[PDB]
Amino acid sequence: AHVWEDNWDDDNVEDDFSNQLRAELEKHGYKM
């Protein structure tokens, strides 16, 4: 089993919506 079950921070678990957000925001890659 994994170390922590309520893990929001994992790659393959996350769904289509903020996958698209991930694509955009990794393309952006900065904050002011």
Partner 1 sequence: DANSALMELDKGLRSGKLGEQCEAVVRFPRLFQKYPFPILINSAFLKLADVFRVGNNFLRLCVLKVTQQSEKHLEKILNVDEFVKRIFSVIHSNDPVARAITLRMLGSLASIIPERKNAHHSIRQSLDSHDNVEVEAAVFAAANFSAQSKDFAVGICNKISEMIQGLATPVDLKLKLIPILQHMHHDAILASSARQLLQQLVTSYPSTKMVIVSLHTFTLLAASSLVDTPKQIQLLLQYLKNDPRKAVKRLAIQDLKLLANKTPHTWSRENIQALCECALQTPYDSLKLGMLSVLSTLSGTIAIKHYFSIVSSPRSSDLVKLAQECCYHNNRGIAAHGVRVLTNITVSCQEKDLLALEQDAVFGLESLLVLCSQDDSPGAQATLKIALNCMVKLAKGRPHLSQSVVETLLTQLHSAQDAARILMCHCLAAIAMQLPVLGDGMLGDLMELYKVIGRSATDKQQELLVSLATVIFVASQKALSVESKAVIKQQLESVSNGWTVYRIARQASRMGNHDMAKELYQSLLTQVASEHFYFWLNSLKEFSHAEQCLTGLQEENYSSALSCIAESLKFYHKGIASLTAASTPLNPLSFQCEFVKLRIDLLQAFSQLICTCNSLKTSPPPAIATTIAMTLGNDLQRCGRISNQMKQSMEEFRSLASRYGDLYQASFDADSATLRNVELQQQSCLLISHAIEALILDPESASFQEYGSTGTAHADSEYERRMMSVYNHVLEEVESLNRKYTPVSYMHTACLCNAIIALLKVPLSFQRYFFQKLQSTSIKLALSPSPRNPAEPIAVQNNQQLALKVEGVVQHGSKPGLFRKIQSVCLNVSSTLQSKIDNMTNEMEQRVEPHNDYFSTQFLLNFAILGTHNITVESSVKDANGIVWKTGPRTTIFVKSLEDPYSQQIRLQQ
> Footprint of partner 1 on this chain (CB under 8 A)?
1-9, 13-18, 20-22, 24-32
Return d(Cα 22, Cα 26) in angstroms, integer: 6
CB of 3 to partner 1, least distance (A): 5
CB of 23 to partner 1, least distance (A): 9
* Residue owning tokens 């289509």: 16
Q: Is residue 16 classed as helix, strand or coil in its secondary structure?
A: helix
CB of 32 to partner 1, least distance (A): 6
